């Protein structure tokens, strides 16, 4: 467990991969990767399914990237003495506006509102580093998706989503 | 000492236990029967893990008798999961690992999960506990095959308790052996 | 014998619970039926008029969950609270056990809460029945009724609210076990038209919904509802 | 109303075979049916042998009928369980004969973790004693083999005395040879 | 029996057993009750400032919503019992996070029988 | 002065004017109802036998609860609502184990006829000061039978309203009328056991509604080494013999 | 309820048993407020955290920990000021905030500066954990609030004027990026930021 | 006739005033048996008509001790004597436990009248239907009060309680010059209560097993006299 | 006296529980008839409206554990949750104690369930009488009881309850031989055949029988038309 | 301090508090359990009379009563040695002795205490008995305070 998460957005598309037991999830276009422990990790997977499940039955409407960032604070700073053990990474697309959203979390629930990449987990600040040197702003879907792969592939096996606003390309490497 | 091993094959799962080791003791333990096509092993901290395993059988039972259905394998081990977790919110965590085998009858493939001390659950074709661990893999790792029938899963397992009574400085006392098939959960006589 | 719901007539019925059954007599009529491939609900609109938001106002027909559906006819206010409980109970087994909860054990959940309403003076019975509408790898699709007494029984085609009887009666004369859901909408579009108190059961008077084919299930829009009803000559 | 103003105003050796269960000791009498033996410190055993025989007592009013050797079995261990790591000093054997389970010896340890079990031994000199039993023992022995067979190895356990033996009439006689 | 019912509480089955619960965050035995603890100690403020009487006649009015206030779908609280408590216009986090047994325990009935003492 | 409904009636807590409280007066009328039990305590036993009162031939009399042991020194008849019965004799049990526990001594039957009473009295204030645990008093009076060291052998009536007499002979439940009547002209205190049995088969055959038998009527006896034990229906239909021989002619 | 303790005992375990305990995020090392001659002036080296739309506070020690309690007494402040219908003033969210830290008796380990504006005037107080408190015109907070302190003391004086006020704000913060949010009576509050393949699959949404 | 519209609880007066519910627990003593107590410096004597439900029964126990210096006798209520004895037998003891100190009889009178009015105001309660007699000697001398169940407790020299209670009152208030004199023979105070309660019995003369005497004082403990012992009296 | 639970009627009766009773000959009969060695346990269905889900409901005679079945009669929604309790407490008895519920102690404890409900004003007590039956574990004696809303409950050799009970009792009466029971399962399958078709005015398809059998077996009939057949053609 | 304990033939001497129905006891350890111990031990007899018809006790059902008041704090037991002295059903002297954990045994003489050692074989050096004897042999054994307990009643006196 602890595997690492790297989230990056390029001009309207976002790409999330994660080291590879599943650790990258989906509640609509909101995209939540989870590295810490396995228990916590499929904890909260259990525990958002369950709530944005009940926000889309009663919204009749699929919970947006921010709605969503702060549901996983607030559900976060709870256990505020028992906090999980996971660094957290939200990424999507708003229906509504297109902006791409890319957020990160401390274990209690801290946001950080990145505006061009996020990394969690283990080995934190190589991948950090190694993203720092190698990202480009606005890049292209394809573009993206190459910077992200060489920047995991830096620090095998690993999945990318690759997020538009309205299709989604899962990728194995 | 206490070992669980799980092997998972094209019709069947095998799972193998240690029997209990005490004072003066002559007569199985580590094995709770949840429903008719899944069994759960157990091993870890004397005296909480059996209380949780039996607590967790009365769970499964209710369930089944609730609903004259069966709980599928990957449900139940959910469940125990959940289970598991919320005993672990209060009180300090207790050395425990669980193995729970089944054939699911609906998706009809024989599927097994192990279930770490923390409440971490993962999808397995083979899984130890305990001193088993490393020699076990060792051969595992290379011997094992998805294809292979349940006599050769029989096989391998017989290989792999005859590695494990050579790497145990103790005259080792041997394992008992039940395999849960499409026909219901059954022991073996030789291990 | 009537004052309270905890006592039992010389008799021996339960006048504060054969009231309730009495009030959703009154409301709009609901009707489901189950083809071989899906089930259709339908249900009359009670209270219209032209001010009223036709469209993003789904009075009748609730998502429970993916799979699953209900149509209620009675008080709206309580079918509200009963609703959200089946939702948490739906997410709590999803959450358990992995697995989408099977509609029966949603509807036995249901309809004990309904009962255990009936059996506390402090509570007056729940006036809602619901027509659940589901599917489950179980037995696969099905459809269950519930009444404010709390029992539920499981039916192919049933019709609940205002005038059930003559809609029974003709769903009884037209129902087949093999319809298509195709023809299960044309049928429920024709017991509802000769069932209502309207004169016409203009698009707007219609609330629809229908679960098919893993499984989509789709509440109507009113355009396609127009669309539809034109589509089998009402 | 006014309530709530005046709230404010102010060794041993068991085994079964076909003639039933032979318990030697260097022994608690649950039941005129079930023998317990409980190994620790003379306050914990004094005082949970009158709980146990409460229990069992009114599970045997309330019933009309025998209690079984495993119900009293699993409520000790559930009760020495609540207090696991409490520093409850117990190691109990509870023994009996029913019909609806014929013998029958199960084991209590003080976390709680019960055991079933053919022969059980405890003290500084069970080794000596399950060496000499485990020779000869075997279920089809006669009563008076049983009994010749505790005497060796238990006179051999303090050479390295109450033979209690329980059937369907219940324990029998002390044994105090 | 006297042994606690280890099925129908939930909450994990005869584990944890009870001797293990000894063992708390140092801020939880406080805040477990800290809405009655500070009503208690309001109530004695009044009691000797007021007299008897207004300490009677406010828990009377708390004990009369409590009695007849039960609707077992709902935790949510009743809306005059926030009025009583000055709580109409104030949160805390035992409201925001007010906080699942699927088949013992959580049914209706299990309310009526703690509501009624029944 | 004009008729009009009375409401004193209703309720437990209602005093009528001359300061009689029914509704635990209509608790000893549902005693009526309940199948006759009889007892009969002398020097050497107490001896204490029930009306079956089976309703139909398809249940199985011998599995009837009428007899309870309360300990292996005491034990008692019942009559009326058997449901509350149940719990009046829960609480007997316990409390007489609780005793044995607590102070290594047998209990006495008259402080456990007193507990059972305090029981009976919680629809008001308990004897302890206890809050009120039931709406109504129980519809079950019950003659608590057993023997100690130092009273001997006794025979307590407890009733619902919370007040018990030590009897000599007691008949309670249908036909406590004709029963109460005809021990009063027969008891002596030269009553031994063995005509103590037969006495009262000749009461229950006096006051039953069919013929005695061993499947209808049963016995039971407290002596010192026996104790508690209720008697086998070959015993039984051997004392109904006996009594239908030395009785006729 | 609230906050739950539901792993305080796991979370030991792990942490005894070498399972790192990730670290929660601090707010950075200083913080100052100084009171002017027209209203008051805070500043920050985290965030500054919105109380009410003319009361603001900046939070030390840990960023969830002020992020949560002055989000919800700025909410306790939205409700009450609806309530009585007037505008809420900062004595309210000092004695608010003191209650609640008070509470949990330190363990949410926050460090505020709260000022702001009121129909009784400009305030400026600091909030320490478990509840102590003190008032001033000015003050800081944090690591290096010695040599912004020092700064204020050498350079505050009265009747200093809005541009004063921020300079002297964003200077102490130097000694100590830089934002700052200036209050004035009877206008509106002006926040003023940074002052200074191997196979593929498609997925459903 | 209007009293049966007002006298359904405690909790209600009477358009008069009146207040029926206790009146009736009040006139609830008249059921119970006769029972007399008369006071002299140096003793105080208890004497009480048992009363059996049968020839085949034994006696009720009219006279309870709570104290070596302190003891009752009750009429009314079985089921509110019982409650009320043990209330006093449990603060008697808690006093002489707790504090060190016997129970000053004054003070167990209005500890008791306490307990007996909050009976008398709340719903669901009932008034204790029970009078009865507390007698013993203290330090500041002998003491004999006469409980009522309205929560009335008042110093006696002497009084009777129970049915045709009205002759032994009489015969009382005729010789209370006389036995308050007595002074110092205990003999001679049982013997003219003896004479008191004669004066209540319609049949059932005073016999070994149906009367029962007690007497406390100076040299005295709270002592019960009945059977042989009490024939020397009759 | 008929308006709460906590009232005696002048002669004895608690007239709300009587009235209980009542509701409970409302319900559709169930029968029970005990064998030497087996136990079967007879329900009238409704007749079934065409448009019912035959394939999942109706079953009206529904086993609390491996071993134990629970008829019932009365109002359905009460017995849905009657059952389920009695469930509960099996498996709490499975685990709290080794040995599995004595078919006594289920019936005692469904029976305390029952009667803790009638002990409040502010509750309906369950109106329905439930016809316990089963063996005990590890025992071939069998066992078969009733209980009733009163918290009353007894052991049968056979018993009816419900609609038309006495139709059905009488007919039990004069023709189970208690002296000696019907002995083979299927002799006792059709002495419940024939008790239920004293009633049922239709054939077999509203009959349901299920048949206990000793070590923890059950079976729920679909075969009956053929021991109607033998019957029909006998009568 | 220490306290000894003598059983014999119909009497019992102990070397304390008079709690009725011929049963003395004391405590030795910290002062204020014993106290609190006694206090409860006499709450507890009272409490027996008041409910069971002020039968007298018997120094076996006494010794069950301090056991399980004993016991009810087994996992943080009051820190003094009790003992009690009295007679039996048979008419026998006797006397029984507690520990912090609540063991029950029967001692036909026991001291305990510091001095316990001392005292225990100072007595079996040298020690059926009459009433007299057993006083003069406490007095060479041993300002202090005795007890004696015979079938006429309790008596109690003061020596050296």
Redesign the interface.
Known sequence: ?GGIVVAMTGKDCVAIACDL?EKIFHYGHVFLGITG???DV??LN?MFRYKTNLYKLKEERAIEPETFTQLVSSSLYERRFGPYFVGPVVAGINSKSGKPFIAGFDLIGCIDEAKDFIVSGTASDQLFGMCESLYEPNLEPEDLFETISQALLNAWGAVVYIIKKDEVVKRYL | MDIILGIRVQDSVILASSK?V??????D?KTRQLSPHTLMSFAGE???T???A???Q??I???S?????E??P??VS??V??????????????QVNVLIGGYDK?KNKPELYQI?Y?????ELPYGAHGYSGFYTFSLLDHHYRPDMTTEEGLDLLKLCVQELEKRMPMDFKGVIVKIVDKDGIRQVDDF | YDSRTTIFSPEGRLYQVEYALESISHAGTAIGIMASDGIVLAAERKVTSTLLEQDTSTEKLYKLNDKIAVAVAGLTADAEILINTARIHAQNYL?????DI?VE?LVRRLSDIKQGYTQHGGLRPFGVSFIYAGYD??YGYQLYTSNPSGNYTGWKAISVGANTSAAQTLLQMDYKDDMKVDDAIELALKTLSKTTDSSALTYDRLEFATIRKEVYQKIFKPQEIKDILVKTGI | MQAIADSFSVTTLAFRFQGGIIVAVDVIEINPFLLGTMAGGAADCQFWETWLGSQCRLHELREKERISVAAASKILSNLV?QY?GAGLSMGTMICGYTRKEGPTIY?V?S???R????????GSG?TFA?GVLDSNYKWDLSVEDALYLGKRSILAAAHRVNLYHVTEDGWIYHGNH | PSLPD??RQ????????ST??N?RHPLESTLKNWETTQRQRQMEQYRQIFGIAEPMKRTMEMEIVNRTDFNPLSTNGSIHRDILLNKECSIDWEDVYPGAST??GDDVHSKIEKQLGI | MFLTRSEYDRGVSTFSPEGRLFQVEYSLEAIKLGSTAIGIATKEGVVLGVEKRATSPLLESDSIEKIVEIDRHIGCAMSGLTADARSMIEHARTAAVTHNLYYDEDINVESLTQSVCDLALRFGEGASGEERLMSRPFGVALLIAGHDADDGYQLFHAEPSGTFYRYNAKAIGSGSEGAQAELLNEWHSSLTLKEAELLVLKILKQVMEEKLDENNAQLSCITKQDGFKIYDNEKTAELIKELKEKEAA | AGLSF??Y??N??LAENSHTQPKATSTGTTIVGVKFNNGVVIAADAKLHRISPKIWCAGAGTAADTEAVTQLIGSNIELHSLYTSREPRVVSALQMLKQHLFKYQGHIGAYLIVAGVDPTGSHLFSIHAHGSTDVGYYLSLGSGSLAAMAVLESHWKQDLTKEEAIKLASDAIQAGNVDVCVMEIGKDAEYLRNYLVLKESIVNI | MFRNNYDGDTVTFSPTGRLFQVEYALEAIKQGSVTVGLRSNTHAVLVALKRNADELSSYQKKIIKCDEHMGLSLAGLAPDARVLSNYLRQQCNYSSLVFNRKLAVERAGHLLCDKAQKNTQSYGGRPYGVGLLIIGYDKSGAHLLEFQPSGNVTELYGTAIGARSQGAKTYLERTLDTFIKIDGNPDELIKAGVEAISQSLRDESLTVDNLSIAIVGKDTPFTIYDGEAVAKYI | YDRALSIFSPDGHIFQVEYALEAVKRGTCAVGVKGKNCVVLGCERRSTLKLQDTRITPSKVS????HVVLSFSGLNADSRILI?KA??E???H??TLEDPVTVEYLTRYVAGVQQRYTQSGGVRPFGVSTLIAGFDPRDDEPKLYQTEPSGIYSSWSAQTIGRNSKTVREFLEKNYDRKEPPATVEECVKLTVRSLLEVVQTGAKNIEITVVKPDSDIVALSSEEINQYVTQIEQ | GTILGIAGEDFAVLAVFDCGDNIVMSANGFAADGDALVKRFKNSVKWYHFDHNDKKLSINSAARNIQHLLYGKRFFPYYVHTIIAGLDEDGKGAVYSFDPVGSYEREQCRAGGAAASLIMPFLDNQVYLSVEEVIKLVRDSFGLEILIVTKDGVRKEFYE
């Open positions: 467990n037991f422990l396995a228990t499929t904890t259990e | 209990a005490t004072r003066g003791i002559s007569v333990d004397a005296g909480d059996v209380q949780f039996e607590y967790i009365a769970n039972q209710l369930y008798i609730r609903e004259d259905y709980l599928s990957q449900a959910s469940f999961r959940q289970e598991l977790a919320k005993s672990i919110r209060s009180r300090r965590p207790y609906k770490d923390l409440g971490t659950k993962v | 959450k358990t056990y992995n697995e099977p054990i790898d179980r | 369980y696991k084991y340890d976390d709680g973790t055991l079933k079990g053919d022969i059980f031994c405890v069970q399950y | 280890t099925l939930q909450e994990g089955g005869a584990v944890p057993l293990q619960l063992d088949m013992v | 539901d792993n005992q796991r030991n375990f | 086993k609390i554990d491996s389920e469930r509960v099996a498996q709490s499975r685990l």
